[PDB]
Amino acid sequence: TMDKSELVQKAKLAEQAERYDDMAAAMKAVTEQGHELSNEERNLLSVAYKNVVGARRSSWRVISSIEQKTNEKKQQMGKEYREKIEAELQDICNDVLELLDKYLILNATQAESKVFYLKMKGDYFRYLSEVASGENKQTTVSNSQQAYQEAFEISKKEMQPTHPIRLGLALNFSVFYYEILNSPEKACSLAKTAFDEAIAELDTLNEESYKDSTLIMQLLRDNLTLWTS
Template identity: 40%
Template sequence: MGPSRAELVLVAELAAEAERYDDVVSQIKTIVAEFDARLVNDERNLLSIAYKNKTNTLRNSWRIVDTLEKMQASRTAPGTTTRQLALIRQQRKKIERELANVCKDIVKLLEKQLLPAARYGEERVFYSKMRGDYYRYLAEFAHEVEREWYAEESLNAYKHAYKHAMQTLDSGHPTRLGLALNFAVFYHDVRKSPERACHLAKSSFDGRSYAVMSLDSEAPTIRDSLQILQLLKDDLVLWSKEIQ
């Protein structure tokens, strides 16, 4: 007899505390395979945290190596490739492969199992937003045709999530606000359109901040909403300066 669902969740929680995110993913995948693809809130959050940490580490590594590669390339005579530059490029491509594998892994889980089983409302918005996020990460470092395909998949996922959120979630709900923030980042970082990013962020920010701030700021969901609203405000300031 294998471990119970509660035991699998306990091990996943311990793994998250120990920052062993591969183990978290393994436990949640076992729950999906052996029990139910309809995860409860705690299970869903554990999965989200695990993939977020796995990809954040790799994305940060990629940015560092990409910057070093550009610096080395600027020092290298045109038409030549130094040994150092070749090694840096080799490392960047290795990180890209690892990052692509992680992103494709969660996208596959979302598309094949989690989204088809998702309940109407927040759960569907949450998973559709995740799908948009990981296609966005793939688009960030992909090249040419592949980049455009990932960007289009990300856009479609965000649009689906946003439409569903507008129909089912309160305007101050943290999942809806988090979606608006990431969708705006997509327009800024992937589509290179600070105008559209500002429009989306502003439409989500206006009228909601006052409604949220008038509520009990000690409630966990209200704290989450306030944090996201602050991020929206910070991005609006930065992007508005770019437009000016």
Template identity: 60%
Template sequence: MGAELSLDERNLLSVAYKNSVGARRQAWRAVNTLEQREASASKGAAILDLIRDYRHKVEAELNSKCHDVLDILTKELVPKAASSESKVFYLKMKGDYHRYLAEFASGESHGKCAQEAHDSYQLASETAIAELPPTHPIRLGLALNFSVFYYEVYASPEKACLLAKAAFDDAMQVMDSLDEDQYKDSAAIMQLLRDNLTLWTSDMQQSADGKAEQDGTAVEDF
């Protein structure tokens, strides 16, 4: 790649990889659930072997796709990011794709992917807080995904809620200064943050009461 991508090029790249990887993430979750169900039902090794073979195939595809985009981000896009907005956008993407790898990795590999995701999200957050307004859609989207990372990968609902609530509250304080279009863009992402906060808070309360938790995330990606 040569110069920094234009806004349209950046968005096209993001959507293309998100759609490609998203379909495989859904497939992995479905086959992983099926594998667990069949294992508990003890229906025979042959069926389980077929399911595991397919899961491994999906994992190989996910691994390849995620590393493709991470290679582009690390070698080309992040170093050439000229604006704060671009830098935060690409660092958020790095965090996202390391998170996707962590979803199916195990052992030492899981820990490494999780740490890489955390470090990318953290650097993006530091830049966003310093250089982007609280209502900026990329800053809000980053807060949404980083909080999901804490909830889903680090299993830390308290930290997830703190991060999401801080982003929501900071944006809320200056929403009145936005024009109509800006307000709509920011409000849409803030609603996603609120949806997750509502569900996560309910899950934590149910856990404290000794009740079964729900499926913990309403919206997991922006």
């Protein structure tokens, strides 16, 4: 069929063509070969599914906004369309989660990769949580927290407070508290602590990632600035 480097090339093409389902299909196939992913492959996989699920999350939100309109077979039509989108979303997140649990998290050698993949797992259980209900929601919310927590603890121990992955994890975990658990309190607490710690140890920045670190440091302040109201 196609070998790793051909798949990776296809994935790069898809990306520029803005064909993200293709890009994800290619990176899904590379992952399924069962070898630890290079930093480049890892980021291609992440970008691909982020865009794939992002499109559905976006559509879900549009329809939801609309749905909040007082008639009702139009609200019955709109509800069924939201569910159709939700179902697509769930299939995407479950594909990713399966990839993470079957290949990525278990095989990750460096603390860096493990935190990255565990944060990813937090993210995609968080995306299920945005649209879940009933008992399913409790499950996805708890699994999201578990992955974020495990990654949180490992990063505090293994990475500098200015590492972009560590900061990104903190950004998303705090977003989890705010938007999913409805804990503005611990969200701002988490964001502010992560920012402060980074500020304190600005001497831990390095050449490869100092731009990414400062950008994420800035998103943390923005979220914080946006939430404290």
